[PDB]
Each structure stands twice: as structure tokens, then as C-alpha cells.
Design a protein around this ligand. Sequence first.
Ligand SMILES: [Cu+2]
Ligand code: NI
Length: 310
Amino acid sequence: NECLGTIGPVTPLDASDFALDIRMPGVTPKESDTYFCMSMRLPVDEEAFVIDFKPRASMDTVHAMLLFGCNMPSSTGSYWFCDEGTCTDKANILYAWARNAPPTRLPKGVGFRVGGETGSKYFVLQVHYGDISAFRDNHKDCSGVSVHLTRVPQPLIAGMYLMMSVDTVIPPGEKVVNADISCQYKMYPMHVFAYRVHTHHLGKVVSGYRVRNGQWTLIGRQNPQLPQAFYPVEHPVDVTFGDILAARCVFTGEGRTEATHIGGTSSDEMCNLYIMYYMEAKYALSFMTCTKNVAPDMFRTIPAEANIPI
Ligand SMILES: [Cu+2]
Ligand code: NI
């Protein structure tokens, strides 16, 4: 079932363009909710641009998939469990496939720059397998993602503005805990075209806004318990020098004996909001982070919807 062997992962389209198949190397899981990770080096050492993703997911088994970019994977193995870790350095997300939430295409002219001196040398593919019902026959699985690379330089460059809580603590029982993140945007204009939220099972609602002279332009709002793909932004949102990116995850503490804090495990929590943007080639940077809350009181003027779960 859909597994190349003798043809390999690389597939020339044209001189410049080519397609690359990041697949699992015939793994079979033992247990449910298993996170498998494997890496692919880039075939070229020159800078390239990623411009498309086709999900190749066997529908009767794969919960979700993620693709990152980094310079140093965690394992040197053929595959590994992602609890060991994805990338030792900063792992940069590019694509998120979710079952039951069809992903959107990248806008035309937009590509993530990869490789070269500065960009990512590796891809790491994280596959989340749900149930084991279809593996009764013990068949090796080759699920993954074909990607479209090219050396033709693209007019617009994709990047990611990661907003995350670092020092949150949820007291057990506590009915409502907000996790507020805010930073002054400090670069050339970006335009936001997608977003993903990630929390674990206590996340009620994550929301993120651009605030320009006091008024709260919404970017994205989602219940993290819904499938965590990138979702499209209604009308693309520019974000200019001086603007403030605010975001608020909202957590409950109920159904918990001890206090929850930020971390990797299932017992711990996360408040990540990934805002995919594009910038003009000449002005572009590929990654931005915000772990602060530089404008804390400002969250009184927050919209209501941010605190209203659905
Ligand atoms: Cu997490
Ligand atoms: Ni605009």
C-alpha cells in the first residue's frame, strides 16, 4: 500500500523543481497514541524554497502529522519515539496535517526558505497514530508527506511567529486561569495567513489579536481540543512596527489533584499559538518568538470572545 522502495524519495519535476517524499520507514506501532519521528536530510546544500505539501496519510490509522525543519535532529536512528525529542536546536514547524480538518494550500508566490547557510538542513516528520484496530495484521506503515522544493527564488517568504507561555501555573480545582502573551512587533511588515493553536487537555480556548492604537483586531480563535491544523485567516492581517501581538490561552484546573505547569508531558500543559505569516523576500525573516507579556494591564480591554469558550 503506497510505499516506494526502488524509486526512492526524490522525484525530479523540472530542472529547478523537485519533490521529496518524507515517509515513515515501514514502522509498526505496539500501542495507541504513539508519536513516531524520523528525519530526512535535504538533498541539496544550496538554499531552496518549499512551496507545497501533499499529505500521504493512510486514513484508517493516522491521527495527525507534523513537519519541522531544523539543523540537528534528536535521534540519529532510522526512526524514534518523539518523546525522546524532535530537534535538539529550535525545531521550526512548516506543515500540520489533521484528520477531519482539511488543510489549506500556501498562497501563490509564498515559500519557506530552507537549507543554504542559514536555513534548515533537515526535515523531521512527526506522525501521530491513533488507534491500532487496522494493525491487527502487523503491516509496516509508510505514511508521510511529499514536499515540493525548488531553487527558483519566490517573491514572498513564509515564516512563523510562535507565541508561548513559559511561566504559567494552573492551581488544581481553579475554574479559570488565563495565560497572556504580548510583544511589540519590531520588524518590517508581515501578513498573517494561517494559525495553529496547541494546548493539552485543559485548554479551553486560545485566541490571538493584533492591537493597533488600542483596538483589538482578531487573528485567530480556536478550541485547542479540536484537530490542531493550521487554519486560514479570514482576511489577511498586516502587522507593522509598533503593533502589539496579544494572545490568551484559557485553562481550567478541574479534574486535577495537583497543580499543572508548562511542559512536554501529558500531565503538563502548553499554550502555543503558531501564526504563519508571509513577508516580502527582501524584508523577510523566517522565525519570531514571544514568551513575554510586555503589556500586562492592556488585557482589560481584551475582547469578550477570548474568554468565551465554544
Ligand atoms: Cu505539547
Ligand atoms: Ni495588508
